[PDB]
């Protein structure tokens, strides 16, 4: 409902306590005009979990559509049973850094001009439908970094545990 929980705090690692030098950093699969972070096969429980899979969306051009896919509880039996997504009101609410901590922010006021359709292919633009999308504005005046979380690390199967997914969107100034 476009509200923010100003009391919500987290970190990039969350409860995994994984150091940043141990993140699996990779770039988004960019189709030139759509930068996609697809977690559909990145977070399944393994004996080596939890890992931090961090998809980096680097934007320096105008009107880029950002798409983020986070597996849904029940999409596969058991594999995503305790998956959580943050912020729950994404893409309207996003996370940004307050020094070490991550705090909920309205993307409306963080990047003015940014386009969020209420629907993505006829379904609500919310992680509860599996996908969020937002198209960045034609002008960005300052460098801006915000975050989404798709965390499956609390899903476990015997000695297997899922992975914590992070989307880091790094927007360089363009336009002006």
């Amino acid at each position, epitope marked *: 409902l476009d509200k923010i929980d100003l009391s919500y705090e987290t970190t990039e690692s969350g*409860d*995994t*306590a*994984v*150091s940043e030098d141990s993140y699996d950093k990779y770039a988004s699969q960019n189709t030139n005009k759509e930068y996609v972070c697809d977690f559909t096969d990145q977070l399944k429980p393994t*004996e080596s979990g*939890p890992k931090v899979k961090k998809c980096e969306v680097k934007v320096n051009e105008p009107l880029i559509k950002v798409k983020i896919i986070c597996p849904l509880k029940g999409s596969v039996e*058991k594999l995503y*049973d*305790n998956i959580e997504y943050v912020p729950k009101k994404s893409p309207y609410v996003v996370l940004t850094k307050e020094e070490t901590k991550l705090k909920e922010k309205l993307l409306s006021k963080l990047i003015y001009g940014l386009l969020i359709s209420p629907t993505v292919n006829e379904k609500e633009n919310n992680f509860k439908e599996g996908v969020i999308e937002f198209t960045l504005p034609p002008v960005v005046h300052k460098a801006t970094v915000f975050y989404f979380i798709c965390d499956n690390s*609390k*899903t*476990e*199967d*015997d*000695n297997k545990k899922g992975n914590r997914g992070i989307v880091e969107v790094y927007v360089e100034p363009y336009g002006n």
Partner: single-chain antibody, 233 residues
Framework: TGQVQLVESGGGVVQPGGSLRLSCAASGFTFSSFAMHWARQAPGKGLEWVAY????????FYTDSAKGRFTISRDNSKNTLYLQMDSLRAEDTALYYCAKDLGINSYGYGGLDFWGQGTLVTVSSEIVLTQSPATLSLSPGERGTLSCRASQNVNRYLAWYQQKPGQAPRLLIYDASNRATGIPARFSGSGSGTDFTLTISSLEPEDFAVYYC??????????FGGGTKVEIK
């Protein structure tokens, strides 16, 4: 439940190279929903994890010393756990506990959240957790602080146990910070990665006991610290 019960049997005195079949009658919970552990405490020593069986009995894990000698099995229609022990050796002398796993609804596997009283077996002749100090002399009312240091990142998957004299271990804290149900609030946990702490805000006379940390981040094997004894000055 508040009526959970585990009753081990089948122990006894055997010579090296002999066999024993341990049994554990499970009561008070949905046995078929929970993985089960065997653990053991050698005379005068700390806690060691032995074996784990999946809720449906289709996957089993073992400590290296038990591989090829011990077989963990279960009958979900008899709510009974078994440990077939073959080719026994003098170092297998220990009190053998059956323990119920903490895991349910896809979270908690590796923690031993309830222990039976145990059955003694006498054979008549890895992530490392460091607990310091080994002994802690304190007075009733003082704040006790126990430390656990892991050889590598165990995330926040560290549990704490209390073994009062003569008694089975009891889960106090799981995943670093989460007090188990029924545990008084004077017990608190903190830490992440490699360094962890258990705080007992005001020691009560019953709190003077041995305490063990345990990791479920990477297993098998499930590993315990050496234990910290909290004595009266």
């Amino acid at each position: 439940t508040g009526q959970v019960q585990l009753v081990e049997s089948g122990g006894g005195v055997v010579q090296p190279g002999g066999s024993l079949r341990l049994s554990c009658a499970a009561s008070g919970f949905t046995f078929s929903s929970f993985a089960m552990h065997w653990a053991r405490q050698a005379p005068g020593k700390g806690l060691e994890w032995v074996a784990y069986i999946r809720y449906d009995g289709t996957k089993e894990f073992y400590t290296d010393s038990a591989k090829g000698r011990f077989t963990i099995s279960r009958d979900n229609s008899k709510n009974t756990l078994y440990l077939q022990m073959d080719s026994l050796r003098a170092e297998d002398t220990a009190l053998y506990y059956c323990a119920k796993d903490l895991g349910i609804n896809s979270y908690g596997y590796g923690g031993l959240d309830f222990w039976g009283q145990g059955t003694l077996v006498t054979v008549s002749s890895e992530i490392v957790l460091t607990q310091s100090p080994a002994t802690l002399s304190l007075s009733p009312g003082e704040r006790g602080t126990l430390s656990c240091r892991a050889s590598q990142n165990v995330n926040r998957y560290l549990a704490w146990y209390q073994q009062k004299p003569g008694q089975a271990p009891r889960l106090l804290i799981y995943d670093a910070s989460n007090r188990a149900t029924g545990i008084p609030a004077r017990f608190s946990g903190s830490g992440s990665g490699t360094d962890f702490t258990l705080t007992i805000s005001s020691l009560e006379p019953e709190d003077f006991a041995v305490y063990y940390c345990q990791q479920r981040a990477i297993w098998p094997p499930l590993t315990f610290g050496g234990g910290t004894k909290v004595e009266i000055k």
